[PDB]
Amino acid sequence: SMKIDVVTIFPEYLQPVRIDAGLVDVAVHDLRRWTHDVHKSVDDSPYGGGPGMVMKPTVWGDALDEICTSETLLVVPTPAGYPFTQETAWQWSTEDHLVIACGRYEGIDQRVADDAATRMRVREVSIGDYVLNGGEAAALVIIEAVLRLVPGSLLEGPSYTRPPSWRGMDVPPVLLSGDHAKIAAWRAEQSRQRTIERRPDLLG
Amino acid sequence: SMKIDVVTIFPEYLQPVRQSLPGAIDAGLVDVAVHDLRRWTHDVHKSVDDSPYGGGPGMVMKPTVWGDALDEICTSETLLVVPTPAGYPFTQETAWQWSTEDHLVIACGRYEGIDQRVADDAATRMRVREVSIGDYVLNGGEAAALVIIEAVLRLVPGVSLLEGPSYTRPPSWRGMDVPPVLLSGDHAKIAAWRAEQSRQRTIERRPDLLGFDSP
Numbered sequence: 001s002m003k004i005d006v007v008t009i010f011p012e013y014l015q016p017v018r019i020d021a022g023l024v025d026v027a028v029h030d031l032r033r034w035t036h037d038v039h040k041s042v043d044d045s046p047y048g049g050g051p052g053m054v055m056k057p058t059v060w061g062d063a064l065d066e067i068c069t070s071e072t073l074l075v076v077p078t079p080a081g082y083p084f085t086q087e088t089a090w091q092w093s094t095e096d097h098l099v100i101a102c103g104r105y106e107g108i109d110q111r112v113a114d115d116a117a118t119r120m121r122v123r124e125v126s127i128g129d130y131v132l133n134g135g136e137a138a139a140l141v142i143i144e145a146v147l148r149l150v151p152g153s154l155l156e157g158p159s160y161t162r163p164p165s166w167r168g169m170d171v172p173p174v175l176l177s178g179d180h181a182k183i184a185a186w187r188a189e190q191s192r193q194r195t196i197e198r199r200p201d202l203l204g
Numbered sequence: 205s206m207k208i209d210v211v212t213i214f215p216e217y218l219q220p221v222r223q224s225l226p227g228a229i230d231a232g233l234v235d236v237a238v239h240d241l242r243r244w245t246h247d248v249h250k251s252v253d254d255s256p257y258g259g260g261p262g263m264v265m266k267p268t269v270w271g272d273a274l275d276e277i278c279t280s281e282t283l284l285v286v287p288t289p290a291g292y293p294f295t296q297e298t299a300w301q302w303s304t305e306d307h308l309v310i311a312c313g314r315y316e317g318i319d320q321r322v323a324d325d326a327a328t329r330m331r332v333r334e335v336s337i338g339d340y341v342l343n344g345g346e347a348a349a350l351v352i353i354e355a356v357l358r359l360v361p362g363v364s365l366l367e368g369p370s371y372t373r374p375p376s377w378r379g380m381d382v383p384p385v386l387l388s389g390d391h392a393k394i395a396a397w398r399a400e401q402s403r404q405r406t407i408e409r410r411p412d413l414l415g416f417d418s419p
């Protein structure tokens with residue numbers, strides 16, 4: 001049974017929304033719980049100058065101290081990360097404890113991850129080559145890709161269902177043929193063509 | 205101003221778009237409207253899916269229901285976005301491109317996809333873009349819709365290489381010091397160090413970006 005703790009300054013964003021079949025426990029934590037000042041400050045100007053802000057190490061350090069254990073896998077979504085793939089989702093789906101640290105894309109002070117890595121496994125990962133303001137949406141994607149793999153190539157080609165004719169377009173007759181070896185071969189070719197057209201990187 | 209309509213059988217799930225988020229609505233730069241696909245059903249049990257022709261696992265969303273929905277929501281100026289693992293890649297360039305659009309409609313699908321005729325039909329009157337946000341599988345297009353909205357909206361007027369490590373105060377923490385060059389005020393040496401750190405991180409984490417083989 002899996003535990004997922006998410007830490008964010010936008011807890012409402014990650015409020016689950018009604019799969020509660022008691023398979024996984026997901027807890028969301030407001031990062032401001034661990035701030036030190038009356039202003040509940042979570043970021044500060046970057047050393048070396050430049051735009052935006054960097055999230056404070058003292059605040060994140062306290063949060064992870066309380067939430068993480070030696071058994072924890074710490075997930076840090078960031079555009080500067082290793083790629084998050086289906087292989088990753090599969091690996092993480094058998095973990096007991098995931099902690100996802102959501103930060104603004106300018107980043108969390110690197111000493112946070114570096115320190116955590118001396119006591120637990122840390123994975124900095126990117127869900128894609130685009131920039132988001134913060135890690136929250138990436139966290140939703142990771143949570144969904146991982147949890148759907150918990151009990152309870154080529155591209156896929158087009159799919160079809162009833163009715164057999166709709167707005168002048170017929171379902172490919174082969175799909176209604178009852179020749180299942182031929183259907184497989186047809187689907188294989190559709191996958192080849194679609195992969196060539198949309199994702200030539202997948203063919204080498 | 206921009207208009208985004210999202211069509212889904214899980215409307216409440218597109219609540220994370222709301223107030224305390226970059227998803228901008230409050231500043232009146234975009235209006236985001238979420239529609240329950242089941243609004244366009246007519247049968248008692250509000251059915252939106254059916255078993256696939258030709259066999260296979262799962263269900264396929266019916267064309268009839270999606271057709272009526274898109275008839276009501278789209279115009280010929282609409283950019284129809286269909287998140288799918290079989291889509292063209294959604295990239296930063298895509299985000300910049302869509303940031304200048306007047307009207308995005310995002311069709312969120314579940315099970316094993318939407319009957320292909322829906323996208324084919326729509327393309328006879330509007331521009332259609334089937335896209336993938338990444339090489340992982342989600343149950344449905346909803347989370348991908350949130351990602352796309354976040355990536356696009358932060359580029360709207362009025363709102364290469366990997367970024368290396370960043371630091372802020374204090375300059376020493378748990379016996380770990382900020383790199384001294386970052387404290388030196390030498391803009392040229394700081395730029396050089398950051399450039400270097402970025403290329404070290406890219407070669408390690410994303411060698412593909414520099415034209416090398418992936419692990």
Ligand SMILES: Nc1ncccc1[N+](=O)[O-]
Nearest residue numbers: 077078126127128132138
């Ligand atoms: N692409 C991203 N942008 C911001 C935060 C996280 C991200 N990611 O890909 O995991």
